[PDB]
Amino acid sequence: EPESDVKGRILDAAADAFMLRGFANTTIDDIADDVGATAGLIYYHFRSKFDIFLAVYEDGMRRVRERVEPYVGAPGTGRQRLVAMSVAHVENLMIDLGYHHVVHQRDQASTALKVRQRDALAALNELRRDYERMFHHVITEGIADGSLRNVDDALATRTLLSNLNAVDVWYRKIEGQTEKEVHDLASQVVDLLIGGIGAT
Amino acid sequence: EPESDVKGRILDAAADAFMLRGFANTTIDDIADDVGATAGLIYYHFRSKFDIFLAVYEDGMRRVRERVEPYVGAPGTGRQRLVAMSVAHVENLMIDLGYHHVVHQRDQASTALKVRQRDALAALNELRRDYERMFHHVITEGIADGSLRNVDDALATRTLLSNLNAVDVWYRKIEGQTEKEVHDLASQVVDLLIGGIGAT
Ligand SMILES: Nc1ncnc2c1ncn2[C@@H]1O[C@@H]2COP(=O)(O)O[C@H]2[C@H]1O
Ligand SMILES: Nc1ncnc2c1ncn2[C@@H]1O[C@@H]2COP(=O)(O)O[C@H]2[C@H]1O
């Protein structure tokens, strides 16, 4: 098996474990069990549980950006782009739920992080801010072009992003739910966020 | 000082401490420090940190219900009632943010809870479900009366509740912000959730 494929299975297992039990209670042994190996294989690829967390965060950010970024500068009104970006964001959340949990999962901790880990975390947090700024940019454009309501752009951006991510309060993966079924659920959610619940 | 007033100060301090540091890292000493007393005063009123958590949850549920319930059966369309209920919910979140954090804050824990504590927790969780069901009832009514869009009532309820609570991602209390200023911010948030961000 290619080493990149083994790493991917580790990240998949770790993302789901961190989601299920939380970072603090997840162990390297949990992750090893879920990929069919020993702790030694995990440590060969990642030196610590926090390094695995950082790698999950990095991969989650890459995946969501690759799904959403193509729409930001595409032809269309602000609303058309915002709908496409928002559906893609929610679809990514629904497909890669464990990665989403990590991306969105304290300064006061029991042990110090390594210097390298703190630098990597800060860079990932800035990447997440850069990603969220794409929504602010499109919302500002849509307010200006009239496809969105004349509301406060900062409040609308913070509200919309919190709402897209709040799908994680209730959504759980269902085995055998199809790609279109997940896309359709994401579309229904975004229809409520952009079109509202109130009539006319 | 009346004992009920001392208890209220303890709950206020604990709600803010649990918000700031989390339940696990908060200590009885933290709470004692914040009310100007010793751990002994805290233990006189509440036997354990989890008992304080339960009392915060209970008081948070009482406060939100008292603010929101009067609207559920009041005269008005489903949308009119939903707007009033939602503004009241968000205002309660903004005013009593630490209580809100507790109400919305694992089965696998390091120590067993007392029997009495597990019973109390289960009852509080059912009270929270009863509260959220008021929104489902009004959304169903508003779909039927045409004041809300013909959308799926279960999805709309889960989405709306997650969105009302997701204000906590970005909102922080500002000292000296007035009651009307907080009410107005809550109204702006609810305007986005009910009316949508998309134009016309
Ligand atoms: N993958 C999914 N597809 C469709 N509906 C879902 C999915 N995940 C969660 N839900 C809905 O969210 C609800 C949350 O509580 P329930 O498990 O009672 O029922 C759930 C479904 O109605
Ligand atoms: N109480 C509040 N009143 C008005 N705006 C707020 C309040 N709390 C948070 N915000 C907004 O939410 C933003 C979150 O990040 P900032 O602190 O950069 O700036 C904040 C404000 O724009």
Residue numbers in the entry:
A (entry chain A), B (entry chain A): 6 to 110, 113 to 207
Please, what does the article write about this entry?
The mycobacterial repressor, DarR, a TetR family regulator (TFR), was the first transcription regulator shown to bind c-di-AMP. Recently, DarR, a 201 residue, TFR regulator of a putative MDR transporter, Ms5347, in Mycobacteria was discovered and represents the focus of this work. Structures of TFR proteins reveal that they share a two-domain architecture with an N-terminal DNA-binding domain and a C-terminal inducer binding/dimerization domain. The DarR N-terminal domain consists of helices 1-3 and the dimer domain is comprised of helices α4-α9. In DarR, dimerization is mediated by helices α8 and α9, which interact with α8´ and α9´ (where the prime indicates the other subunit in the dimer) to form a four-helix bundle dimerization module.
We next obtained the structure of the Rhodococcus sp. USK13 DarR-cAMP complex to 1.44 Å resolution. The structure revealed clear density for cAMP molecules bound at each dimer interface, in the same location bound by c-di-AMP. Unlike c-di-AMP, the cAMP appears to be tightly bound to DarR; the B-factors (ave) for the cAMP is 33.5 Å2 compared to 22.6 Å2 for the protein and 36.0 Å2 for water molecules. Interestingly, in this structure the cAMP is rotated ~90 relative to the nucleotides in the c-di-AMP bound structure. Nonetheless, the contacts to the cAMP are provided by the same sets of residues that bind c-di-AMP. The Arg165 side chain contacts both the cAMP ribose and phosphate groups in the DarR-cAMP complex. The cAMP adenine N1 and N6 atoms are read by hydrogen bonds from Gln184 while the adenine N6 and N7 atoms are specified by the backbone carbonyl and amide nitrogen atoms of Arg179. Finally, the side chains of DarR residues Trp177, Tyr178, Ile181 and Leu192 make hydrophobic interactions with the cAMP adenine moiety. The distance between recognition helices in the DarR-c-di-AMP and DarR-cAMP structures is ~43 Å indicating that they also adopt structures more similar to the DNA-bound state. Because cAMP interact with residues from both subunits of the DarR dimer, it would be predicted to function as a stabilizer of dimerization.
